[PDB]
Amino acid sequence: SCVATVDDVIEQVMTYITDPKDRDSASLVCRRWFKIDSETREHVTMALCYTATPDRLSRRFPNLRSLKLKGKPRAAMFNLIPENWGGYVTPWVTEISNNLRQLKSVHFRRMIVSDLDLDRLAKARADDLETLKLDKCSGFTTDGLLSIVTHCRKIKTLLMEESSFSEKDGKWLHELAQHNTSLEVLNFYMTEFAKISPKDLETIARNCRSLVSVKVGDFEILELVGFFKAAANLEEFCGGSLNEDIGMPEKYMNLVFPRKLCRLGLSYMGPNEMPILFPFAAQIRKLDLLYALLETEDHCTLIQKCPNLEVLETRNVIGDRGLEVLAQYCKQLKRLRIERGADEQGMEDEEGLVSQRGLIALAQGCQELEYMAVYVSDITNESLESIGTYLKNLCDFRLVLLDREERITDLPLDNGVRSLLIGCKKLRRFAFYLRQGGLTDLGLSYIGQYSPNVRWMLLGYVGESDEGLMEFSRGCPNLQKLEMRGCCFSERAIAAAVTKLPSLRYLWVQGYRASMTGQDLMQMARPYWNIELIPSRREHPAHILAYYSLAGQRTDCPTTVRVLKEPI
Amino acid sequence: KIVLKSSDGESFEVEEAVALESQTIAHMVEDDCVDNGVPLPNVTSKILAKVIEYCKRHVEAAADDDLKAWDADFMKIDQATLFELILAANYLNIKNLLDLTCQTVADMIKGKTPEEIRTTFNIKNDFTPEEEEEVRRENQWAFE
Amino acid sequence: ELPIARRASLHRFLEKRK
Ligand SMILES: CC/C=C\C[C@@H]1C(=O)CC[C@@H]1CC(=O)N[C@H](C(=O)O)[C@@H](C)CC
């Protein structure tokens, strides 16, 4: 019995440290701690797969239980990135097949997934694979799906949301129906499936007692009544298709929705069918009227009925009027997204504009807001001040102002941005997309100066000259990822700002004063710094994408993508 | 009532259900060596004392707000003692108690930086600068 | 002339809408 050290107890304690940022530190106190973290780390996420070799990952964390890889830049979600850009997942699955023999959950995000590489996954990991998330991926088919549902007999969560694949049949769903029991969450929310049987979906609901969430394609809701009755423990449902014919005015008034259902969004839902929600609106906590066919007035009447709503996603049709309703009925609101609707034939009505009015109304009512993303048709410095004044635990704030409107009340937002950034000091992600006059170099530097916590920024049309970008660059202590498009800065100005930024590890840019030389970008050449130049897919000016990588320049570039390498 | 003989000869009179918090003393009333009292010579007597105190109070949950209270106040001890308790809970088998001592040590780490850590534990940093750099690079560029 | 790029999930929907 000698005095007991930490070293006598650390292997045990380490497994109680859950925070990814504390494991980070802990791995760095010494060689022993590093090894212990290495052999106990359960989940890792790579924000950019090209950042390291799959070898390096398996060597560092041999006993991962969960992995998550992201590929294509965020811009890809906007048909800005070429389809062939890369993000291929195969090297990663041959590595999983061979060295991550403990893996029970895989999440691919914005990646290329082939039938082969998922057949490989399925066989390699089989019964052990509890969860698989094909999140916004492409390049596979139903054969792939069929392969993972037959070999991975114990899948608890299976997801394809917004993924695109080739649909050759429906046997994958049916194979789930006939043999799966463990299913807890099933998700093909933004997907064109035309060959799967609602019957199978119902027979799955019957057999999976722990089925909590399911999101789905353009199924006719009526075809799902069998389903809903059977899905007792269902808490979330999004998707489906409400199709009204005139021949039935009460087509949908006899809907059994599962009793616990509290997170939902019915697609195409009009004002006529909207009422089927009233019977239990008190209970609804998440609402997805993103793909709903109801107008500004109809919004107010529904929102007004859901006092316990904490998440709401809708189009700008919600209107200022809608935002005002939200303002005093839903005080517990934590996340709000207002995507932009049909900006073609008028708005979607004459109240389908959000403005200073709505924002400042919202800022006063829903003070518990943590996430706010909004496409606005008009702002005022005042509104941003009220934001930064009332809602303190805002972590994620994104604002984009539409070019629809010709004159914007008061434009240079320098002083509004500032009070906002100063009031919400919990802010980690921040996006600000304007029109040209939107922000002066003075304001831009205000952003650098007052965003100590922000790791990610998406910047719109900020600044007036490179003076602004430089002023900006002397700030942003913790900026890691920077995305800017539609800016007036020059190559050497960018390259310079990159050098000044301490924390930056990922840079994407579209639109900048170029030079045939190309050589001005070069003045940011560091070791481990990869820079790439891009076109565009689904007039599109050059993209710059640069990131740190321990791996070197990728092998798998398309023809459309150029890798800069000192003097050519 | 059961007898527990500490690591320096020290009989301890403890109740039935109190000693049963330890699945080590539970799985030892089968092949009941209890005839001569349960011998456990890997626990300092000073420590075993503190352990019984914990189990005593938790069993009196027959009659939650005021528990996290006593618990927090129970943990106001020095590091060296804290560690000896973890070791003890692991030697016995008190799951509720390990989840507390370990978590107490973990709380000491949560928030500190690598230097601040080996400072408040007195640990010599044995990283070659290349090693430290690779690890740091992996940590901030690739994984997490 | 940089147009506001539409998030693809909504682009798909806005067409189905009409
Ligand atoms: C370089 C390409 C990436 C982005 C550019 C796209 C535009 O043209 C306008 C903004 C959009 C990007 C985007 O991600 N905006 C935020 C979001 O979707 O969360 C806003 C929708 C928040 C209100």
* Pairing between β-strand A529-534 and β-strand A213-215 as defined by DSSP bridges: unpaired
Q: Are the beta carbons of A159 and A133 closer than 8 angstroms?
A: yes
Ligand 1: residues within 6 Å at CB?
A: A 74-75, 78, 80, 373-375, 398-400, 431, 433, 458, 483, 485, 510; C 4-5, 7
Residues A9 and A48 in one domain: no
Six-digit token string for A354? 């959000």
Tell me the nearest-neighbour CA distance from A342 into chain C, angstroms. 7
* Pairing between β-strand A164-166 and β-strand A213-215 as defined by DSSP bridges: unpaired
- Gap between the Cα atoms of A349 and A317, Å rounded: 7
Decide if A28 and B114 are in contact by the 8 Å CB cutoff. Answer: yes
Six-digit token string for B16? 């039935």
Containing H/E element for A226? helix A225-230
Residues A244 and A377 in one domain: yes
Following CA atoms A515, A520, A526, A529 in sequence, which dihedral angle do they give, to the nearest 10 degrees? -10
Using the atom order of ligand 1, give the atom closest to the CA of residue C4.
Answer: 8
Residues A63 and A2 in one domain: no
Burial of A253 (0-12, 13-18, 19+ CB in 10 A): exposed
Six-digit token string for A238? 């999004």
- Gap between the Cα atoms of A291 and A300, Å rounded: 17
Alpha-helical (H) ranges within chain B are 16-19, 23-26, 45-59, 67-74, 79-91, 95-109, 114-119, 129-137
Handedness of CA A10, A12, A16, A20 (dihedral sign): positive
Residue A506 known to bind ligand: no
Decide if A9 and B83 are in contact by the 8 Å CB cutoff. Answer: yes
The reply to whether C15 touches chain A by the CB within 8 Å rule is no
| Domain B1-144: CATH class, spelled out | alpha beta
Residue C7 DSSP one-character state = P
- Shortest CB distance from A342 goes to which of C2, C4, C14? C14
Say how many Å lie between the CA of residue A403 and the centre of ligand 1.
14
Nearest alpha-carbon partner for A475 in A490, A453, A491: A453
At A424, is the secondary structure helix, strand, or coil? Answer: coil
Q: How many angstroms separate the first and last alpha carbons of chain C?
A: 26
- Shortest CB distance from A30 goes to which of B79, B86, B118? B118
Q: Are the beta carbons of A69 and A111 closer than 8 angstroms?
A: yes
**Cα–Cα separations (whole angstroms), residue A190 to A136, A267, A547, C13:** 9, 11, 30, 9
* φ, ψ at A565 (rounded to 5°): -140, 75
Q: Which residue has the tokens 């750099």?
A: B133
Residues A132 and A99 in one domain: yes
**Cα–Cα separations (whole angstroms), residue B74 to B23, B65, B68, B78:** 22, 15, 10, 11
The residue of A14, A22, A25 whose CB has the most chain B CBs within 10 angstroms, and thus the best one to mutate to test that interface, is A25
Decide if C4 and A400 are in contact by the 8 Å CB cutoff. Answer: yes
Burial of A484 (0-12, 13-18, 19+ CB in 10 A): buried
- Shortest CB distance from A339 goes to which of C1, C7, C12? C7
At A481, is the secondary structure helix, strand, or coil? Answer: strand
Burial of B69 (0-12, 13-18, 19+ CB in 10 A): exposed
Interacting residues of B26 by C-beta distance below 8 A, sequence separation 6+: B20, B93
C-alpha R_g of chain B: 20
Q: Are the beta carbons of A414 and A445 closer than 8 angstroms?
A: no
Six-digit token string for A224? 């799902």
Q: Are the beta carbons of A362 and A326 closer than 8 angstroms?
A: yes
Nearest alpha-carbon partner for A556 in A530, A538, A523: A530
10 Å Cβ neighbour count for B1?
8
Nearest alpha-carbon partner for A310 in A277, A335, A337, A281: A335
Q: Are the beta carbons of A155 and A185 closer than 8 angstroms?
A: no
Residues A190 and A259 in one domain: yes
* φ, ψ at B19 (rounded to 5°): -70, -15
Containing H/E element for A530? strand A529-534
Interacting residues of A337 by C-beta distance below 8 A, sequence separation 6+: A290, A312, A313, A314, A371, A372, A373, A374
Residues A30 and A119 in one domain: no
Interacting residues of A411 by C-beta distance below 8 A, sequence separation 6+: A437, A438
Residue A337 known to bind ligand: yes
The reply to whether A6 touches chain B by the CB within 8 Å rule is yes
Residue A285 known to bind ligand: no
Interacting residues of B101 by C-beta distance below 8 A, sequence separation 6+: B75, B82, B83, B85, B86, B89
- Residues of C with Cβ-Cβ distance to A293 under 8 angstroms: 17
Task: Enumerate neighbours of B (3 or more CB pairs within 8 A).
Answer: A
Residues A399 and A414 in one domain: yes
Nearest alpha-carbon partner for A377 in A340, A342, A412, A335: A340
Q: Is B37 left (phi over 0), alpha (psi -120 to 50) or beta?
A: left
The reply to whether A538 touches chain B by the CB within 8 Å rule is no
Method used to determine the 3D structure: X-ray
Residues A278 and A191 in one domain: yes
Q: Is A518 left (phi over 0), alpha (psi -120 to 50) or beta?
A: left
Interacting residues of A379 by C-beta distance below 8 A, sequence separation 6+: A355, A356, A359, A399, A401, A408, A409, A413, A416
Six-digit token string for A364? 């006063």
Six-digit token string for A552? 């070197």
Residues A567 and A462 in one domain: yes
Using the atom order of ligand 1, give the atom closest to the CA of residue C2.
Answer: 8
Contacts of B73-80 with C-beta under 8 Å, sequence gap 24+, read B75/B100, B75/B101, B75/B104, B79/A6, B79/B108, B79/B121, B80/A3, B80/A4
CB-based burial, A32-64: b 16+ in 10 Å, e otherwise: ebbebbbeebebbebbbbbbbbbebbbebbeeb
Decide if A19 and B113 are in contact by the 8 Å CB cutoff. Answer: no
Q: How many CB pairs under 8 A join A and B?
A: 111
Q: Are the beta carbons of A372 and A396 closer than 8 angstroms?
A: yes
Task: Enumerate neighbours of A (3 or more CB pairs within 8 A).
Answer: B, C
Containing H/E element for A266? strand A263-266
Decide if A8 and B114 are in contact by the 8 Å CB cutoff. Answer: no
Q: Are the beta carbons of A388 and A424 closer than 8 angstroms?
A: yes
Containing H/E element for A457? strand A456-459
Tally of helices (H runs) and strands (E runs) in chain A: 18, 23
Considering its fold, how many domains does chain A have in total?
2
In angstroms, how far is CA B137 from the centroid of its own chain?
34
Interacting residues of B125 by C-beta distance below 8 A, sequence separation 6+: A29, A30, B114, B118, B132
Interacting residues of A35 by C-beta distance below 8 A, sequence separation 6+: none
At B82, is the secondary structure helix, strand, or coil? Answer: helix
- Gap between the Cα atoms of B67 and B53, Å rounded: 13
**Cα–Cα separations (whole angstroms), residue A559 to A49, A54, A82, A562:** 20, 24, 10, 7
Six-digit token string for A481? 């990822």
Q: Which residue has the tokens 């990814």?
A: A20
Six-digit token string for A301? 């009447």
Nearest alpha-carbon partner for A532 in A540, A541, A542: A542
Nearest alpha-carbon partner for A300 in A283, A320, A325: A325
**Cα–Cα separations (whole angstroms), residue B119 to A22, A185, A341, B109:** 16, 45, 56, 11
Q: How many angstroms separate the first and last alpha carbons of chain B?
A: 52
- Gap between the Cα atoms of A508 and A530, Å rounded: 12
Residues A49 and A30 in one domain: no
CB-based burial, A67-94: b 16+ in 10 Å, e otherwise: bbbbbbbbbbbbbbbbeebbbbbbebbe
Q: Are the beta carbons of A430 and A453 closer than 8 angstroms?
A: no
At A242, is the secondary structure helix, strand, or coil? Answer: coil
At A250, is the secondary structure helix, strand, or coil? Answer: coil
Q: Is A350 left (phi over 0), alpha (psi -120 to 50) or beta?
A: alpha
- Gap between the Cα atoms of A456 and A479, Å rounded: 6
- Gap between the Cα atoms of A290 and A338, Å rounded: 8
Residues A306 and A451 in one domain: yes
DSSP secondary structure, A316-342, as one string: GGGHHHHHHHHHHH-TT--EEEEE---
- Gap between the Cα atoms of B51 and B28, Å rounded: 18
* Pairing between β-strand A543-548 and β-strand A506-510 as defined by DSSP bridges: antiparallel
Residue C6 DSSP one-character state = P
- Gap between the Cα atoms of A474 and A456, Å rounded: 16
- Gap between the Cα atoms of A329 and A281, Å rounded: 12
* φ, ψ at A420 (rounded to 5°): -65, -60
Residue A375 known to bind ligand: yes
Q: How many CA atoms lie within 13 A of A62 on its CB side?
A: 5
- Domain residues for A17? 1-41
Residue A74 known to bind ligand: yes
Following CA atoms B79, B83, B86, B90 in sequence, which dihedral angle do they give, to the nearest 10 degrees? 180
Residues A80 and A26 in one domain: no
- Gap between the Cα atoms of A12 and B106, Å rounded: 10
DSSP secondary structure, A112-155, as one string: B--HHHHHHHHHHHGGG--EEEEET-EEEEHHHHHHHHHH-TT-
Residue in A379, A485, A508 to alter for ligand 1 test, most ligand atoms within 8 A of Cβ: A485
Q: Which residue has the tokens 């980690």?
A: A428
Residue A260 DSSP one-character state = T
